[PDB]
């Protein structure tokens, strides 16, 4: 029949997709350290011969919000969160290197120094932290050095042990890979320290996503979903009133 | 020569979607 | 030879069977995680095919998978679950299959009117001269 | 001791489920009256 | 051609999961920790896990 | 002619002047 | 032929 | 396609390996 | 109108630059 | 008397996990009676 | 007959 039916259908499945990638925004409204993803449509047309009435749509991912997540304080001496841009570098289960933005920080039972998601933390030689096992009061600066006092040490013998690599790349030169972790778009690029990142300690940085944003995008996918499937019903019926030139 | 691949919703896509398999996609071309 | 229509004609009308059906069973498999076969169970397409070199007839040379990938499902607690916790769908969208319900009963209907208009004329034919 | 334990149903988690069956069900009964509409135009075939 | 496949429910599992804990102050009134099950026998006769 | 705003279905080149339209 | 097709019989 | 042993019925088993 | 050689099929691009 | 036989429609083509007619005449889909 | 026959003739 006529092409209009799958030029809408190609258009409605991707509504959907860019309903499902802001369903994935307010389910991590409460996420820490979460960087809302955009949802953008590209058009694309069919070059060839004939009339250029037939154009496609495609959803697509054009950026993140790089924006300031909220900041929680909760008085935790192990929780940070970068002030203003900055990034915290860590190594995943893999152990490829990448960027993020989730400090809420622990201990394990051998000192290295972990993120809520389990990812370890590089520190001043580009190596995971490792902080002696009896400690008796982590006190983390706002440079990003860690000083810890030695268990049964005097309270004056605290003493800096590493300091928390902090990176602060362009942002438009990240993106987010399948893990959560913002990697540099061009491969094997050096992730060099920054001495301009502070890291406020005490405080956990939330999702950046504004819930309104999401919801008013919403209603708009919506009403055009339901724009072009109205569209392939009066496709389907103009085929079916042409039936009727083959009678004879 | 002979012609093929899949008709309906998954070949009336933009290449960028990449339902149809690669190698029915060859088949679109020319086969003999 | 309006005989030979017949056949193209005929051979269309078992091509778009042939897409309903498989069309049936994506829409009944939709939400299965389970088969027999031990293997998530993947969108299929039957393959149409010209031997053009007259009539050409349309021939299914088979059916195809889809080869995107299958809709992961967070559900740790479900018994099938990864190590991840992660249980896999079919790759099946529910807006293609019913664009393919459409154009498959609309080129099904389409066929029988050239069989029965090509009917007339072969009819037509042994009127001639007598 | 001093306490019953109740049923472990996600309410929720039900709900949501049932909303999809009710669709993947209304597909299925839209392709049964394609399928009835399919073959009344076929029978013009033996139609003459 | 390999086009048509049928699809039956079927329960692969229950939610084990621990339920809601109600308080009742009852002596005669207990909850299973986590994980567990009491033994009891029906009208039939036969152990079953309640 | 005709209308005088048409658009042309080849792709963009710069270099060659498109004849599907009408460019008369 | 088309290559990676599936097949009727049980696998 | 005419042949002369008469087709086998289909088989929709719970488990390919049970067949 | 008709022509004696096939036309060329449609180009879908997401980027024109790469074709 | 070799005849094929069952019930027509819905209930057969159903599949067999279904077990809705009954085993008797499911047994006569294969020429037996 | 069929073994599962049901009669026209009340039970």
Redesign the interface.
């Given at each position: 029949?006529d092409?209009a039916?799958?030029?809408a259908?190609?258009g409605?499945?991707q509504n959907?997709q860019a309903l499902q990638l802001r369903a994935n925004n307010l389910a991590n409204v409460s996420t820490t350290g979460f960087r809302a993803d955009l949802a953008q449509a590209?058009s694309?047309?069919?070059?060839?011969?004939?009339?250029?009435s037939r154009v496609?749509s495609?959803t697509e991912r054009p950026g993140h919000n790089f924006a300031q997540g909220s900041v929680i304080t909760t008085g935790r001496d192990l929780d940070v969160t970068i002030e203003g841009s900055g990034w915290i570098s860590v190594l995943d289960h893999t152990g490829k290197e990448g960027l993020t933005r989730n400090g809420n920080l622990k201990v394990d039972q051998n000192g290295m120094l972990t993120n809520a998601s389990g990812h370890l933390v590089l520190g001043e030689n580009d190596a995971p932290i490792t902080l002696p096992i009896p400690l008796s009061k982590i006190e983390i600066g706002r440079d990003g050095t860690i000083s810890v006092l030695p268990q049964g040490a005097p309270a004056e013998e605290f003493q800096a042990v590493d300091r928390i690599k902090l990176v602060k790349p362009n942002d438009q030169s990240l993106f987010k890979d399948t893990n959560g972790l913002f990697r540099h778009k061009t491969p094997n690029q050096p992730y060099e320290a920054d001495a301009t990142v502070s890291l406020q300690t005490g405080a956990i940085e939330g999702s950046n996503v504004n819930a309104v944003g999401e919801m008013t995008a919403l209603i708009d996918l919506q009403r055009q979903f339901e724009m072009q499937?109205k569209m392939?019903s009066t496709a389907?019926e103009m085929?079916?009133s042409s039936?009727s030139l083959?009678?004879? | 020569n002979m012609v093929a691949g899949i008709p309906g919703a998954l070949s009336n896509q933009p290449p960028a979607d990449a339902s149809i398999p690669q190698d029915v996609a060859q088949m679109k071309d020319g086969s003999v | 030879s309006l005989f030979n229509v017949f056949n193209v004609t005929g051979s269309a009308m078992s091509a778009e069977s042939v897409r309903l059906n498989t069309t049936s069973s994506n829409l009944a498999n939709a939400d299965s995680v389970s088969s027999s076969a031990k293997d998530t169970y993947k969108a299929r397409h039957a393959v149409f095919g010209a031997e053009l070199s007259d009539t050409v007839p349309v021939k299914v040379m088979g059916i195809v998978e889809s080869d995107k990938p299958l809709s992961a499902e967070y559900n740790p607690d479900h018994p099938l679950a990864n190590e991840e916790g992660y249980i896999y769908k079919p790759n099946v969208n529910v807006m293609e299959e019913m664009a393919n319900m459409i154009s498959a009963s609309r080129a099904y209907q389409t066929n029988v009117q050239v069989a029965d208009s090509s009917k007339q004329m072969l009819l037509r034919t042994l009127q001639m001269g007598q």
């Amino acid at each position: 029949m006529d092409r209009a039916l799958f030029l809408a259908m190609s258009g409605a499945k991707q509504n959907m997709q860019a309903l499902q990638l802001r369903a994935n925004n307010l389910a991590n409204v409460s996420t820490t350290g979460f960087r809302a993803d955009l949802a953008q449509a590209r058009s694309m047309q069919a070059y060839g011969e004939g009339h250029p009435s037939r154009v496609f749509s495609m959803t697509e991912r054009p950026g993140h919000n790089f924006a300031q997540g909220s900041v929680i304080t909760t008085g935790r001496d192990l929780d940070v969160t970068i002030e203003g841009s900055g990034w915290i570098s860590v190594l995943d289960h893999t152990g490829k290197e990448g960027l993020t933005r989730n400090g809420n920080l622990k201990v394990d039972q051998n000192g290295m120094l972990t993120n809520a998601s389990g990812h370890l933390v590089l520190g001043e030689n580009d190596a995971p932290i490792t902080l002696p096992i009896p400690l008796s009061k982590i006190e983390i600066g706002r440079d990003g050095t860690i000083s810890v006092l030695p268990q049964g040490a005097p309270a004056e013998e605290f003493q800096a042990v590493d300091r928390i690599k902090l990176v602060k790349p362009n942002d438009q030169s990240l993106f987010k890979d399948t893990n959560g972790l913002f990697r540099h778009k061009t491969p094997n690029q050096p992730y060099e320290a920054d001495a301009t990142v502070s890291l406020q300690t005490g405080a956990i940085e939330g999702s950046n996503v504004n819930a309104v944003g999401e919801m008013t995008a919403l209603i708009d996918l919506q009403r055009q979903f339901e724009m072009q499937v109205k569209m392939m019903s009066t496709a389907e019926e103009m085929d079916k009133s042409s039936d009727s030139l083959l009678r004879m | 020569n002979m012609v093929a691949g899949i008709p309906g919703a998954l070949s009336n896509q933009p290449p960028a979607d990449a339902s149809i398999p690669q190698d029915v996609a060859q088949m679109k071309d020319g086969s003999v | 030879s309006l005989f030979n229509v017949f056949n193209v004609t005929g051979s269309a009308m078992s091509a778009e069977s042939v897409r309903l059906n498989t069309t049936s069973s994506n829409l009944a498999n939709a939400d299965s995680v389970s088969s027999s076969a031990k293997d998530t169970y993947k969108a299929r397409h039957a393959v149409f095919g010209a031997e053009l070199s007259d009539t050409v007839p349309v021939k299914v040379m088979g059916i195809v998978e889809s080869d995107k990938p299958l809709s992961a499902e967070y559900n740790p607690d479900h018994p099938l679950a990864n190590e991840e916790g992660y249980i896999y769908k079919p790759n099946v969208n529910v807006m293609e299959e019913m664009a393919n319900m459409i154009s498959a009963s609309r080129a099904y209907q389409t066929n029988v009117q050239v069989a029965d208009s090509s009917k007339q004329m072969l009819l037509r034919t042994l009127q001639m001269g007598q």
